[PDB]
Tab-separated table of C-alpha atoms and ligand atoms in Angstrom:
chain	number	residue	atom	x	y	z
A	6	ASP	CA	3.759	20.525	28.890
A	7	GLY	CA	1.236	23.399	29.200
A	8	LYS	CA	1.601	24.864	25.749
A	9	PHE	CA	-1.336	26.103	23.484
A	10	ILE	CA	-2.017	23.570	20.722
A	11	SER	CA	-3.524	24.159	17.299
A	12	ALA	CA	-5.202	21.633	15.071
A	13	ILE	CA	-5.521	22.330	11.326
A	14	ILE	CA	-7.905	20.008	9.601
A	15	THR	CA	-7.625	20.077	5.609
A	16	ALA	CA	-10.573	19.830	3.674
A	17	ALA	CA	-9.430	22.044	0.629
A	18	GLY	CA	-8.488	19.358	-1.883
A	19	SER	CA	-11.796	17.924	-3.265
A	20	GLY	CA	-13.681	19.056	-0.320
A	21	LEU	CA	-16.810	17.511	0.882
A	22	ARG	CA	-17.391	16.009	-2.477
A	32	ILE	CA	-19.202	12.293	0.698
A	33	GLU	CA	-21.065	10.778	3.610
A	34	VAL	CA	-20.776	7.630	5.561
A	35	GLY	CA	-23.292	5.945	8.176
A	36	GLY	CA	-25.553	8.836	7.523
A	37	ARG	CA	-22.811	11.391	8.618
A	38	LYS	CA	-20.554	13.631	6.405
A	39	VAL	CA	-17.085	12.542	6.625
A	40	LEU	CA	-15.643	15.739	7.897
A	41	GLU	CA	-18.282	15.602	10.575
A	42	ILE	CA	-17.134	12.087	11.753
A	43	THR	CA	-13.473	13.734	11.759
A	44	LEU	CA	-14.654	16.705	13.476
A	45	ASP	CA	-16.499	14.862	16.042
A	46	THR	CA	-13.376	13.165	16.882
A	47	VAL	CA	-11.069	15.873	17.119
A	48	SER	CA	-13.253	17.966	19.256
A	49	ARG	CA	-12.938	15.581	22.216
A	50	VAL	CA	-9.185	15.708	22.183
A	51	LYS	CA	-9.540	18.639	25.043
A	52	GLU	CA	-5.531	19.064	24.823
A	53	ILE	CA	-6.111	20.818	21.483
A	54	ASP	CA	-7.055	24.236	22.237
A	55	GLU	CA	-8.280	25.616	18.746
A	56	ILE	CA	-9.501	23.817	15.507
A	57	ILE	CA	-8.740	25.532	12.268
A	58	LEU	CA	-10.482	24.009	9.214
A	59	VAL	CA	-9.058	24.846	5.685
A	60	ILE	CA	-11.841	24.634	3.394
A	61	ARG	CA	-12.715	25.302	-0.296
A	62	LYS	CA	-14.828	28.535	-0.779
A	63	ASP	CA	-17.367	26.588	-2.630
A	64	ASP	CA	-18.311	24.449	0.610
A	65	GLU	CA	-18.328	27.646	2.926
A	66	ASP	CA	-22.175	27.149	3.310
A	67	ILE	CA	-21.984	23.444	4.204
A	68	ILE	CA	-18.934	24.314	6.517
A	69	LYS	CA	-20.690	26.998	8.332
A	70	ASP	CA	-23.755	24.779	9.040
A	71	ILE	CA	-21.605	21.921	10.321
A	72	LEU	CA	-19.911	24.109	12.599
A	73	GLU	CA	-23.045	25.146	14.363
A	74	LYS	CA	-23.361	21.789	15.846
A	75	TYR	CA	-20.295	22.628	17.663
A	76	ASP	CA	-19.502	24.899	20.568
A	77	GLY	CA	-15.815	25.664	21.238
A	78	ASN	CA	-13.043	27.053	19.544
A	79	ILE	CA	-13.540	26.247	15.916
A	80	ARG	CA	-12.908	28.496	12.760
A	81	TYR	CA	-12.439	28.250	8.878
A	82	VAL	CA	-10.337	29.828	6.438
A	83	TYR	CA	-10.088	29.455	2.697
A	84	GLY	CA	-7.452	26.915	1.177
A	85	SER	CA	-5.404	27.351	-1.857
A	86	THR	CA	-4.198	25.885	-4.893
A	87	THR	CA	-2.033	23.225	-3.744
A	88	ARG	CA	-1.647	21.165	-0.263
A	89	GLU	CA	1.124	23.144	0.793
A	90	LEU	CA	-0.652	26.492	0.074
A	91	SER	CA	-3.473	25.538	1.960
A	92	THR	CA	-1.688	24.262	4.861
A	93	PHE	CA	0.044	27.685	4.833
A	94	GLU	CA	-3.388	29.536	4.872
A	95	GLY	CA	-3.843	27.433	8.040
A	96	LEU	CA	-0.583	28.236	9.625
A	97	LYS	CA	-1.288	31.850	9.192
A	98	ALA	CA	-4.487	31.648	10.789
A	99	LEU	CA	-3.288	30.203	13.964
A	100	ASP	CA	-3.736	32.027	17.354
A	101	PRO	CA	-0.508	34.136	18.226
A	102	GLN	CA	-0.208	31.790	21.550
A	103	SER	CA	-0.009	28.732	19.455
A	104	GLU	CA	3.069	26.900	20.150
A	105	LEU	CA	2.326	23.540	18.823
A	106	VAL	CA	0.301	22.373	15.649
A	107	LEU	CA	-1.352	19.021	14.719
A	108	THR	CA	-2.409	18.548	11.096
A	109	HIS	CA	-4.885	16.245	9.964
A	110	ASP	CA	-6.809	15.101	6.532
A	111	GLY	CA	-10.535	15.846	7.035
A	112	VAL	CA	-11.074	12.888	4.919
A	113	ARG	CA	-9.456	10.310	7.444
A	114	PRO	CA	-12.471	10.205	9.812
A	115	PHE	CA	-11.440	6.810	11.492
A	116	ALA	CA	-8.270	8.206	13.318
A	117	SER	CA	-9.019	7.279	17.012
A	118	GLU	CA	-8.796	9.695	19.809
A	119	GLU	CA	-5.852	7.676	21.037
A	120	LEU	CA	-3.851	8.342	17.830
A	121	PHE	CA	-4.497	12.252	18.381
A	122	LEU	CA	-3.075	11.780	22.152
A	123	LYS	CA	-0.243	9.605	21.093
A	124	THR	CA	0.904	12.176	18.301
A	125	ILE	CA	0.488	15.095	21.010
A	126	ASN	CA	2.555	13.432	23.835
A	127	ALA	CA	5.569	12.609	21.333
A	128	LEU	CA	5.877	16.187	21.246
A	129	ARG	CA	6.910	16.268	24.773
A	130	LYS	CA	10.604	15.237	23.510
A	131	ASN	CA	10.266	15.838	19.811
A	132	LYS	CA	9.783	18.783	17.629
A	133	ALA	CA	8.422	16.817	14.423
A	134	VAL	CA	6.013	13.787	14.692
A	135	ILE	CA	4.158	11.798	12.139
A	136	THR	CA	1.950	8.644	12.188
A	137	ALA	CA	2.719	5.819	10.108
A	138	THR	CA	2.332	1.883	9.577
A	139	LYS	CA	4.578	-0.712	8.251
A	140	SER	CA	3.715	-1.390	4.895
A	141	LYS	CA	1.779	-4.717	4.347
A	142	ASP	CA	2.691	-4.661	0.842
A	143	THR	CA	6.326	-5.433	-0.253
A	144	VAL	CA	8.224	-2.489	-1.392
A	145	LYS	CA	10.779	-2.203	-3.864
A	146	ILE	CA	13.274	0.604	-4.963
A	147	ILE	CA	13.114	0.611	-8.840
A	148	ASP	CA	15.493	2.380	-11.423
A	149	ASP	CA	14.912	4.727	-14.247
A	150	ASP	CA	14.936	1.742	-16.652
A	151	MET	CA	11.919	-0.194	-14.841
A	152	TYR	CA	14.490	-2.866	-13.205
A	153	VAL	CA	14.718	-3.617	-9.441
A	154	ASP	CA	17.430	-1.451	-7.751
A	155	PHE	CA	16.973	-3.342	-4.426
A	156	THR	CA	14.382	-4.327	-1.886
A	157	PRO	CA	14.567	-2.663	1.464
A	158	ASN	CA	14.255	-4.246	4.642
A	159	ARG	CA	10.587	-4.605	5.296
A	160	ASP	CA	10.654	-4.182	9.126
A	161	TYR	CA	11.753	-0.304	8.180
A	162	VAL	CA	9.522	0.404	5.501
A	163	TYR	CA	6.373	2.659	6.766
A	164	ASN	CA	3.580	4.293	5.072
A	165	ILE	CA	2.707	7.455	6.293
A	166	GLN	CA	-0.888	8.661	7.064
A	167	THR	CA	-2.096	11.659	9.092
A	168	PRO	CA	-2.032	13.203	11.956
A	169	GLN	CA	1.285	14.883	11.927
A	170	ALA	CA	2.479	17.436	14.763
A	171	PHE	CA	5.349	20.085	14.944
A	172	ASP	CA	6.936	22.873	17.109
A	173	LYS	CA	4.521	25.825	15.436
A	174	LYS	CA	7.374	28.063	15.071
A	175	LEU	CA	9.768	25.646	13.836
A	176	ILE	CA	7.314	24.318	10.847
A	177	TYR	CA	6.150	27.868	9.977
A	178	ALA	CA	9.966	28.911	9.555
A	179	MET	CA	10.322	25.775	7.557
A	180	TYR	CA	6.931	26.670	5.210
A	181	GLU	CA	8.475	30.205	4.791
A	182	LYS	CA	11.445	28.857	3.500
A	183	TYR	CA	9.591	26.073	1.547
A	184	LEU	CA	7.552	28.830	-0.509
A	185	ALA	CA	10.816	30.731	-1.210
A	186	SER	CA	12.197	27.568	-2.939
A	187	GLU	CA	11.852	25.647	-5.985
A	188	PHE	CA	11.517	22.262	-4.008
A	189	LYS	CA	8.688	19.949	-4.173
A	190	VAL	CA	7.755	17.599	-1.140
A	191	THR	CA	5.845	14.461	-0.364
A	192	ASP	CA	4.837	15.854	3.015
A	193	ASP	CA	5.598	18.469	5.532
A	194	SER	CA	7.796	16.102	7.440
A	195	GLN	CA	10.197	15.852	4.393
A	196	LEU	CA	10.973	19.459	4.975
A	197	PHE	CA	13.417	18.603	7.691
A	198	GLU	CA	15.503	16.572	5.166
A	199	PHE	CA	15.256	19.136	2.549
A	200	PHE	CA	16.623	21.897	4.913
A	201	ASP	CA	19.181	19.650	6.624
A	202	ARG	CA	17.751	19.763	9.950
A	203	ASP	CA	19.164	18.130	12.940
A	204	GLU	CA	15.809	17.737	14.420
A	205	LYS	CA	14.673	14.212	14.313
A	206	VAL	CA	11.124	13.370	13.190
A	207	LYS	CA	9.660	10.937	15.425
A	208	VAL	CA	7.279	8.469	14.067
A	209	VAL	CA	4.184	7.056	15.975
A	210	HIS	CA	2.519	3.677	15.097
A	211	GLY	CA	-0.829	4.846	13.341
A	212	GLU	CA	-3.748	2.514	12.616
A	213	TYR	CA	-4.580	0.350	9.416
A	214	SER	CA	-8.027	1.326	9.700
A	215	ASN	CA	-7.188	5.046	9.560
A	216	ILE	CA	-7.874	5.249	5.678
A	217	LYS	CA	-8.702	8.133	3.234
A	218	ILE	CA	-12.003	8.273	2.120
A	219	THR	CA	-12.033	9.648	-1.854
A	220	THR	CA	-13.493	7.103	-3.977
A	221	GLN	CA	-16.841	5.527	-4.402
A	222	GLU	CA	-15.514	2.329	-3.041
A	223	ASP	CA	-14.107	3.672	-0.002
A	224	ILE	CA	-17.511	4.976	0.954
A	225	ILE	CA	-18.835	1.587	0.596
A	226	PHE	CA	-15.990	0.017	2.588
A	227	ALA	CA	-16.427	2.798	5.204
A	228	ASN	CA	-20.218	1.988	5.634
A	229	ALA	CA	-19.112	-1.521	6.412
A	230	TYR	CA	-16.313	-0.758	8.655
A	231	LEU	CA	-18.579	1.528	11.139
A	232	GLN	CA	-21.205	-1.689	11.265
A	233	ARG	CA	-18.250	-3.798	12.624
B	1	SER	CA	4.796	-21.114	-25.917
B	2	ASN	CA	5.507	-17.725	-27.967
B	3	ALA	CA	7.143	-17.237	-31.090
B	4	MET	CA	8.900	-14.379	-30.220
B	5	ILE	CA	10.366	-16.423	-27.104
B	6	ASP	CA	12.058	-19.234	-29.131
B	7	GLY	CA	8.939	-21.378	-28.908
B	8	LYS	CA	9.938	-22.229	-25.385
B	9	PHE	CA	7.335	-24.075	-23.150
B	10	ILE	CA	5.784	-22.155	-20.609
B	11	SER	CA	4.516	-23.470	-17.096
B	12	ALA	CA	2.550	-21.504	-14.662
B	13	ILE	CA	2.368	-22.333	-11.084
B	14	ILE	CA	-0.674	-20.997	-9.316
B	15	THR	CA	-0.464	-21.027	-5.612
B	16	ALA	CA	-3.622	-21.691	-3.455
B	17	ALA	CA	-2.012	-23.701	-0.637
B	18	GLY	CA	-1.975	-20.657	2.141
B	19	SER	CA	-5.333	-20.858	3.900
B	20	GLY	CA	-6.377	-22.012	0.526
B	21	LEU	CA	-9.967	-22.327	-0.550
B	22	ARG	CA	-11.217	-21.681	3.106
B	23	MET	CA	-10.699	-19.169	5.899
B	30	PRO	CA	-15.880	-20.709	5.252
B	31	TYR	CA	-15.127	-20.348	1.660
B	32	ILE	CA	-13.360	-17.321	0.190
B	33	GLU	CA	-16.081	-16.112	-2.317
B	34	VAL	CA	-16.435	-13.026	-4.143
B	35	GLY	CA	-19.360	-12.068	-6.687
B	36	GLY	CA	-20.863	-15.403	-6.097
B	37	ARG	CA	-17.718	-17.295	-7.380
B	38	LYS	CA	-15.042	-18.836	-5.503
B	39	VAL	CA	-11.678	-16.650	-5.752
B	40	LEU	CA	-9.496	-19.596	-7.152
B	41	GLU	CA	-11.996	-19.940	-10.022
B	42	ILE	CA	-11.879	-16.277	-11.048
B	43	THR	CA	-8.112	-16.618	-11.430
B	44	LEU	CA	-8.068	-19.952	-12.885
B	45	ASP	CA	-10.589	-18.701	-15.339
B	46	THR	CA	-8.301	-15.859	-16.501
B	47	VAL	CA	-5.258	-17.853	-16.491
B	48	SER	CA	-6.639	-20.788	-18.537
B	49	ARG	CA	-7.472	-18.190	-21.135
B	50	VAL	CA	-3.853	-17.605	-21.760
B	51	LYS	CA	-2.890	-20.012	-24.548
B	52	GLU	CA	0.775	-18.804	-24.641
B	53	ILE	CA	0.911	-20.762	-21.228
B	54	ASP	CA	1.616	-24.558	-21.804
B	55	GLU	CA	0.679	-26.040	-18.510
B	56	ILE	CA	-0.964	-24.956	-15.185
B	57	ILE	CA	0.119	-26.340	-11.927
B	58	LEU	CA	-1.886	-25.780	-8.993
B	59	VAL	CA	-0.419	-25.929	-5.626
B	60	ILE	CA	-3.057	-26.826	-2.866
B	61	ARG	CA	-3.789	-27.587	0.501
B	62	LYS	CA	-4.682	-31.350	0.863
B	63	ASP	CA	-7.671	-30.532	2.737
B	64	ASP	CA	-9.091	-28.785	-0.169
B	65	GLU	CA	-8.305	-31.657	-2.637
B	66	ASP	CA	-12.207	-32.683	-3.313
B	67	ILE	CA	-13.133	-29.399	-4.165
B	68	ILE	CA	-10.213	-28.714	-6.356
B	69	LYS	CA	-11.223	-31.789	-8.576
B	70	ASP	CA	-14.478	-30.181	-8.906
B	71	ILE	CA	-13.340	-27.003	-9.955
B	72	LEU	CA	-10.933	-28.695	-12.217
B	73	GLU	CA	-13.555	-30.547	-14.101
B	74	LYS	CA	-14.698	-27.330	-15.919
B	75	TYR	CA	-11.368	-27.314	-17.599
B	76	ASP	CA	-10.249	-28.855	-20.612
B	77	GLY	CA	-6.412	-27.776	-20.580
B	78	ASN	CA	-3.239	-29.096	-19.298
B	79	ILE	CA	-4.142	-28.238	-15.657
B	80	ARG	CA	-3.145	-30.237	-13.044
B	81	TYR	CA	-2.429	-30.179	-9.124
B	82	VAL	CA	0.003	-30.915	-6.412
B	83	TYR	CA	0.185	-30.776	-2.635
B	84	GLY	CA	1.806	-27.596	-1.063
B	85	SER	CA	3.929	-27.317	2.123
B	86	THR	CA	4.221	-25.376	5.506
B	87	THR	CA	5.745	-22.084	3.802
B	88	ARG	CA	4.751	-19.816	0.306
B	89	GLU	CA	8.456	-21.050	-0.571
B	90	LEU	CA	8.207	-24.685	0.305
B	91	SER	CA	4.812	-24.729	-1.574
B	92	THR	CA	6.390	-23.109	-4.818
B	93	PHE	CA	9.257	-25.721	-4.901
B	94	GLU	CA	6.644	-28.412	-4.780
B	95	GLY	CA	5.194	-26.543	-7.897
B	96	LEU	CA	8.652	-26.143	-9.435
B	97	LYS	CA	9.377	-29.978	-8.921
B	98	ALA	CA	6.152	-31.007	-10.643
B	99	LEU	CA	6.865	-28.934	-14.023
B	100	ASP	CA	6.886	-30.978	-17.358
B	101	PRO	CA	10.625	-31.754	-17.973
B	102	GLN	CA	10.329	-29.713	-21.467
B	103	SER	CA	9.511	-26.292	-19.377
B	104	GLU	CA	11.891	-23.384	-19.887
B	105	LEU	CA	10.020	-20.879	-18.586
B	106	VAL	CA	7.740	-20.344	-15.287
B	107	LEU	CA	5.235	-17.768	-14.451
B	108	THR	CA	3.812	-17.831	-10.721
B	109	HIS	CA	0.897	-16.155	-9.478
B	110	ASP	CA	-1.229	-16.135	-6.229
B	111	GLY	CA	-4.474	-18.086	-6.382
B	112	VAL	CA	-5.977	-15.303	-4.318
B	113	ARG	CA	-5.415	-12.253	-6.806
B	114	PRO	CA	-8.348	-13.097	-9.196
B	115	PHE	CA	-8.536	-9.603	-10.693
B	116	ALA	CA	-5.081	-9.612	-12.719
B	117	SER	CA	-6.094	-9.200	-16.466
B	118	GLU	CA	-5.507	-11.378	-19.101
B	119	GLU	CA	-3.147	-8.537	-20.768
B	120	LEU	CA	-0.930	-8.408	-17.418
B	121	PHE	CA	-0.186	-12.020	-17.923
B	122	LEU	CA	0.566	-11.451	-21.290
B	123	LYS	CA	2.856	-8.421	-20.633
B	124	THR	CA	4.758	-10.494	-17.818
B	125	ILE	CA	5.436	-13.458	-20.427
B	126	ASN	CA	6.585	-10.947	-23.255
B	127	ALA	CA	9.265	-9.322	-20.863
B	128	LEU	CA	10.896	-12.760	-20.597
B	129	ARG	CA	11.914	-12.214	-24.136
B	130	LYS	CA	15.112	-10.224	-23.158
B	131	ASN	CA	14.890	-10.701	-19.412
B	132	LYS	CA	15.449	-13.876	-17.075
B	133	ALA	CA	13.298	-12.529	-14.164
B	134	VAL	CA	10.326	-10.351	-14.349
B	135	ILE	CA	7.838	-8.996	-11.904
B	136	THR	CA	4.670	-7.120	-11.406
B	137	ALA	CA	4.780	-3.762	-9.297
B	138	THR	CA	2.773	-0.676	-8.941
B	139	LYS	CA	3.863	2.908	-8.024
B	140	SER	CA	3.015	3.508	-4.497
B	141	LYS	CA	0.313	5.659	-3.982
B	142	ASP	CA	1.192	6.117	-0.281
B	143	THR	CA	4.067	7.868	0.714
B	144	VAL	CA	6.979	5.569	2.035
B	145	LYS	CA	9.517	6.637	4.601
B	146	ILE	CA	12.273	4.297	5.794
B	147	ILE	CA	12.715	4.402	9.620
B	148	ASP	CA	15.133	3.375	12.117
B	149	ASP	CA	15.078	1.135	15.149
B	150	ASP	CA	14.320	4.103	17.468
B	151	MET	CA	11.298	4.852	15.321
B	152	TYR	CA	12.685	7.956	13.804
B	153	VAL	CA	12.600	8.930	10.015
B	154	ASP	CA	15.764	7.911	8.252
B	155	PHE	CA	14.768	9.223	5.161
B	156	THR	CA	12.146	9.713	2.251
B	157	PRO	CA	12.899	7.620	-0.808
B	158	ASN	CA	12.387	9.125	-3.994
B	159	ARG	CA	8.563	8.802	-4.761
B	160	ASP	CA	8.923	7.824	-8.095
B	161	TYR	CA	10.950	5.065	-7.709
B	162	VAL	CA	8.899	3.327	-4.731
B	163	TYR	CA	6.696	0.371	-5.990
B	164	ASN	CA	4.653	-2.233	-4.489
B	165	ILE	CA	4.928	-5.890	-5.897
B	166	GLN	CA	2.202	-8.077	-6.965
B	167	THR	CA	1.794	-11.194	-8.940
B	168	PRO	CA	2.454	-12.463	-11.480
B	169	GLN	CA	6.211	-12.976	-11.653
B	170	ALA	CA	7.922	-15.080	-14.202
B	171	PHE	CA	11.612	-16.454	-14.651
B	172	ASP	CA	14.138	-18.394	-16.605
B	173	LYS	CA	13.008	-22.091	-15.184
B	174	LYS	CA	16.548	-23.389	-14.645
B	175	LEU	CA	17.685	-20.097	-12.971
B	176	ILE	CA	14.641	-19.968	-10.699
B	177	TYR	CA	14.887	-23.638	-9.929
B	178	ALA	CA	18.735	-23.225	-9.140
B	179	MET	CA	17.974	-20.297	-7.072
B	180	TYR	CA	15.433	-22.047	-5.188
B	181	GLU	CA	17.898	-24.986	-4.388
B	182	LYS	CA	20.483	-22.492	-3.071
B	183	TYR	CA	17.450	-21.085	-0.798
B	184	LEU	CA	16.629	-24.213	0.647
B	185	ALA	CA	20.014	-24.932	1.452
B	186	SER	CA	20.441	-21.480	3.024
B	187	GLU	CA	19.160	-19.654	6.233
B	188	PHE	CA	17.798	-16.763	4.359
B	189	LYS	CA	14.462	-15.289	4.639
B	190	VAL	CA	12.799	-13.826	1.485
B	191	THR	CA	10.022	-11.308	0.840
B	192	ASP	CA	9.354	-12.852	-2.638
B	193	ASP	CA	11.075	-14.894	-5.126
B	194	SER	CA	12.794	-12.084	-7.150
B	195	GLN	CA	14.608	-11.031	-3.926
B	196	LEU	CA	16.706	-14.492	-4.240
B	197	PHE	CA	18.350	-12.382	-7.086
B	198	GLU	CA	19.812	-10.299	-4.651
B	199	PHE	CA	20.706	-12.725	-1.832
B	200	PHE	CA	22.958	-14.735	-4.240
B	201	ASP	CA	24.415	-11.815	-6.025
B	202	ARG	CA	23.111	-12.240	-9.498
B	203	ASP	CA	23.886	-9.730	-12.115
B	204	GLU	CA	20.691	-10.804	-14.165
B	205	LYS	CA	18.578	-7.743	-13.711
B	206	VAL	CA	14.705	-8.203	-12.537
B	207	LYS	CA	12.332	-6.335	-14.973
B	208	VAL	CA	9.381	-4.603	-13.661
B	209	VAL	CA	6.390	-4.549	-15.640
B	210	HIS	CA	3.699	-2.106	-14.433
B	211	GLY	CA	0.940	-3.958	-12.606
B	212	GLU	CA	-2.757	-3.168	-11.909
B	213	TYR	CA	-3.854	-1.177	-8.889
B	214	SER	CA	-7.068	-3.335	-8.808
B	215	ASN	CA	-4.887	-6.649	-8.629
B	216	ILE	CA	-5.240	-6.702	-4.991
B	217	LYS	CA	-4.804	-10.006	-2.654
B	218	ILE	CA	-8.041	-11.678	-1.165
B	219	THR	CA	-7.301	-12.911	2.216
B	220	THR	CA	-9.447	-10.858	4.956
B	221	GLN	CA	-12.758	-10.170	5.491
B	222	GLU	CA	-11.854	-6.540	4.906
B	223	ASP	CA	-10.480	-7.534	1.351
B	224	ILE	CA	-13.768	-9.492	0.622
B	225	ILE	CA	-15.756	-6.190	1.262
B	226	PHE	CA	-13.267	-4.473	-0.734
B	227	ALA	CA	-13.339	-6.800	-3.776
B	228	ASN	CA	-17.300	-6.711	-4.007
B	229	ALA	CA	-17.328	-3.011	-3.875
B	230	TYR	CA	-14.842	-2.888	-6.917
B	231	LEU	CA	-17.197	-5.549	-8.648
B	232	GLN	CA	-20.163	-3.323	-8.348
B	233	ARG	CA	-18.768	-0.484	-9.401
C	301	LIG	CL1	19.366	9.790	7.170
C	302	LIG	NA1	20.882	-0.607	-9.835
């Protein structure tokens, strides 16, 4: 396709408080995402308190990047990203700012899945055995492990689609696990495609992740 | 044994017959992983005996490790799968054994309290497993790599160990398993394969109770210990 593609990178949770390999975590993420030339614009969703750090980080980069303030939930912040998208935007990729190890290949794979799908997510087969349990803390059943996947990021969507879904989401009293669950809640015929992710594509939040992350770079 | 559980004799089977003690020795904080585990289990006085299931190649180092312990602790050789190893452990239990707890030798961080909680659940249940609510969001997907559905997140758990069972029951289930062509994810799934109406009780586990197998896990375990 020749469509305009937007990337929204969220850093509006705990924000920048984090640095691994002598680089702020968001910068590593930013580095990787800025090399994906298929992506026409990058929108950072940030905490207002980190505005100065962010402005500074963005000086290092040329090309189409800008930021907007996040909000009080994950979904409210994403929607702030969505409203900020270029009017030309036809496809949107989303990615956690605190997942710095997503390879360029993974962003590319997520994007290429948009050729024939309107919704795409990344996920990996769970290495830990899952059980579904009941409300009395007894096992209900053990799902087939070959079909149990843990989601990560990036995700990507037809921009008009997910925007309309987000608008319906905010008019509702529904709670969702992630954006792709919206296609279930709002009875969609649109199938959500899964792209195999990377086991090294971890979230870096705790103090130990940082240590682990410093070691991973060294290997 | 435990007074609240009819004074029934309790056995523990610790499996260390995977890659076993070596991977280069599996060490964390300056101590062999199996030693940290065995240290914890041997402090649980409710457990009447401890059976280690080992690789034959690790026997000499196993003996050296076991000298430090006074208790009713011994070892048998394991086999070629987790399950066949567990069965060697089950065959070696004291004739008086009425309850059996199993635990992975490479899960060194399970607290003593977690073992006690697992044992106390045997008071009213014949099967007990430890598990933790999944912090990562799970999807069930299909053969064409599309999302089938997102399970209700409050009911999605990742299992760990210990697990524990009525001894005759788990032994009988094991004989059925051996005579079958089923493959199980863990021992408690035996209850589903053989149509048991005895329910498997879930005890909240510990997020810190990780398995140590890869070089990554060791890095992670050390960062946890230095925290
Ligand atoms: Cl479905
Ligand atoms: Na049930």
